Every structure is written in structure tokens, then in C-alpha cells.
From Swiss-Prot:
Role of this protein: Rhomboid-type serine protease that catalyzes intramembrane proteolysis.
Periplasmic topological segments: 25-50, 97-100
Enzyme class: hydrolase
The protein, known as: Rhomboid protease GlpG
Protein family membership: Belongs to the peptidase S54 family.
Keyword Isomerase: no
Membrane-crossing residue ranges in chain numbering: 4-24, 51-71, 76-96, 101-121, 128-146
Subcellular location(s) per record: Cell inner membrane
Length: 157
């Protein structure tokens, strides 16, 4: 199993648990995605919204599907690759969610979808704005990778 997978999966569990133990209101205010010109610069906001879950199922599904497949990416492409995907798909699925619906969204689906998006193409070849844009970031990113991969393998035994 992967180190970053597990730091991340660990993290969503603690924060959920704490959302229960007294207030989510602290958590939700600190992490939400900029709703506000000032908050623009509060840079953790682009990502942090991914770390808050809205229900026992919202989280059980996201963590199973991210542990398992985030699992895959880390163990196959390394921990940096998984960290980039997390960071980039987090910021982008959010940027895309804020535009269509505003800054009231939380959790790891956009991420999970990027994650599945990247595993699907890569598998396929070499074997809810957040959701779609995430999938797309996945599907695109993997294809770019696959391409650079095959590129160098061309001067190899």
C-alpha cells in the first residue's frame, strides 16, 4: 500500500471524526474554497475542501475508491505522481465547481474521478462538475504520460 495514499486516507478520517466531535463549523469555514475576494490568497483553500466529507456514505465510498486506486497510482508511478494528481485535480475540480455552482462543495470525488480517469486510460493503453472535470484531468494526464513513456522506450532494447 502507498504512503501518500495512506496519509491522505488517514487525513479524511481524522477530519471527518472531528467534524463530529464538536464543530464542523470551524473545519468547514477554514477549508471551504474561496467564496470571497480576500480568501482568494488563502491558498490552502484551492485544495483543502477535498478533506471534508458530508456523510458516512460520502466518505466510505470516496475512501474505498481512493484507497484502492490511489493505491494503484502510487505503487506503480510513485508517490510524487500521486501527490501531483491529488494537488492538481484538487485545485482544478474545485475551480470548475466554484464556477458552475459556487463554493459549497466538499470531498474527494473530483479527486477519485481524476484518479480513475488516469488509471482507465493508462490501463486501456498499456495494461457533478467536479466529477467530470476530474475524470477529464485524469483521462488527459494519463494520455500525456503514456505518450512520453512510449516516447523514450523507443530508444530502448
Amino acid at each position: 500500500q502507498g504512503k501518500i495514499t495512506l496519509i491522505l486516507t488517514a487525513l479524511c478520517v481524522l477530519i471527518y471524526i472531528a467534524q463530529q466531535l464538536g464543530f464542523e463549523d470551524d473545519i468547514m469555514y477554514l477549508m471551504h474554497y474561496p467564496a470571497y475576494e480576500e480568501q482568494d490568497s488563502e491558498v490552502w483553500r484551492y485544495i483543502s475542501h477535498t478533506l471534508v466529507h458530508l456523510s458516512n456514505l460520502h466518505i466510505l465510498f470516496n475512501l474505498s475508491w481512493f484507497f484502492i486506486f490511489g493505491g494503484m497510482i502510487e505503487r506503480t508511478f510513485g508517490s510524487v505522481k500521486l501527490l501531483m494528481l491529488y494537488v492538481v485535480a484538487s485545485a482544478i475540480t474545485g475551480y470548475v465547481q466554484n464556477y458552475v455552482s459556487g463554493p459549497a462543495f466538499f470531498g474527494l470525488s473530483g479527486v477519485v474521478y481524476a484518479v480513475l480517469g488516469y488509471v482507465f486510460i493508462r490501463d486501456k493503453l498499456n495494461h457533478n462538475a467536479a466529477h467530470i472535470s476530474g475524470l477529464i484531468v485524469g483521462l488527459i494526464w494519463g494520455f500525456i504520460d503514456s505518450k512520453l513513456r512510449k516516447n523514450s522506450l523507443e530508444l530502448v532494447p
